[PDB]
């Protein structure tokens, strides 16, 4: 009924590194990538730190002339995409390019570019807007430009499901491959909302931590002194591949993507329900899609955003799905270190989940000094935990109560 | 292998009407919905007309208090969604709500809201941004709020593939139902980019017609004196339903959704290739997905945007897919009347395609006074053409060279 889908390539920019292996070394070491933001003047803002991408040089991937039309969220998406296509060793030919596509998305897209063109329009009027504004700032153009730069002719689209984007992108790209619409898909997410509208919009909603004096401690999922999420930038991308197609060309396979689930809370615009019953259904859907019993799960990479309401819902949902086995699995939030990459969070965390399968180690939940009422599971507090990981889950639960769960598994 | 998917409900706001049947009466009569734009001062702009939604009253759907947080693209999406859920006669219960989802998207989303919050931020600083800015302006919240207002717990996501959004949303929602992930999906698209950044961004790219003296004549697909697309607002939404589920409750079925195809040009950021070879592959994929031979197609609702390069590519692609039969089918662009609803274009045109199957009539391509070189097919110039329509196709081809084709068919 379904062809099998594996991960043959990965790419990343995060607040911990300009590629995957540098970012992952950071994760394993408990390193925070959070810091006061240098690129702009945040003095008037109630929050002043974030996970920024540091030292990014777009001209590793594109000429200065190409790069200049494109919002940072696009540059970030192409870079992760390029890394991953490279990482995969895939050679794109006339014989396969119609079988290779792209699903790279974003939660908010080109907010920086829109900001800047907004300034021009207000001060100098319509004619000063760039002619590349639209193509260089709408969300589908990570997918757009990547297909052009790589001559990829397969399914070409983009999701935008806020903080769940990255997770849904990967899952539905795998469904493209399982359905026969593609053999290969580049999927993932990118974001750069660290601009005045991003930080101010999230500040206005009071959704962000305001621990300005100690930014590396701001993101503390399941800690009783948590005060909101930490906004972060970057991108993740995976090369998904039908199993036989990868065997045929001798691909290195990191892991198998076995399950994808989805759900809606149908509850509230920004807050999850106390019992996490939407997240519970999503994980259950993802497990059944993988043909798995809850007891076969060894590691969960949580959404774990460091909001009061969400961290606790996620515990409820895990306890209700997994029962007693909730105490045997390890769950951690690597947002404790990376911050919340929004639409890219799902993508980088899928990659963290795959790496956790490769190296048999559960990354840590840093800053988990005083676990709140109920937060009594193995949350890998403080430091990496080597252990058996056969099956690894990655959740994302975003505004609009939109939920997504991926299930990965060691390959053989 | 696949469950069968039918259309049981439809909703719409367009520049021709505040619902489906008013909009469709306009279409059949050759009525243009294009007019100089009243809602803002366009004097400094090189284009000054558009397809606006006229007389919209959001309080038919939501309280003033609800409505006020939400960008117009969201209001427009919920309204079409509500219409269509209503139109369908579906009763949402605890027994089915986990089987009912939403895929409603947009190409650019809340550009108006972002504009306004941009002004506040510039003049008055961060603290003046609304706390509802983010939830009320990001694209996934049509889906978000609809699932909350209707208690829908099934798959919840949103696409953003620019001018192809509406087409992809519907196609992938049908795939949700064919796969077993849902029995029912509300899918479609909404847009309101008629704000300074929209009109100015598209003006800066020189992509818009500038026929300000005669706006009802600006949109003239395949006419030799065409000078770019006409920007338009609104929304379409369809209730997709597994076939047995609809039979079981005695649903009225408009038509069957039998095919969905996708492709990438991999060519250019904004311009299609001269031969339309990407669009050709997309239609071919869509036909094969439907189990259909080209000769079985009676009517095509074209992308037909009134750009020089795109209108002509689409002819090339149709001639190459359909061969001699290209001269027996009828193709028309209802953008001649509606203008280009961008991310909603696909959604309203899917609805036009379904209505064309219901009433056995091909809508007209208005303004097609002098067909360009090569534009010698039956393009239903000027006035509606009653005829046999068993099978109807709807194309969309958007920036990034992203392509989508839907195939509908009379039900029995
Ligand atoms: K996660
Ligand atoms: K169309």
Residue numbers in the entry:
A (entry chain A), B (entry chain A): 2 to 413
What did the authors write?
A potential target for antibiotic drug discovery is β-ketoacyl-(acyl-carrier-protein) synthase II (FabF), which is one of the essential elongation condensing enzymes of fatty-acid biosynthesis, a highly conserved metabolic pathway among key microbial pathogens. FabF requires a catalytic triad, which in the P. aeruginosa enzyme (PaFabF) comprises Cys164, His304 and His341.
The PaFabF-C164Q mutant crystallized in a different space group (C2221) compared with the wild-type structure and the structure was determined to 2.40 Å resolution. The binding-site residues are also well aligned, although we note that Phe400 is rotated away from the catalytic centre owing to an extension in the length of residue 164, where glutamine replaces cysteine. The mutant is believed to mimic the substrate-bound state of FabF.
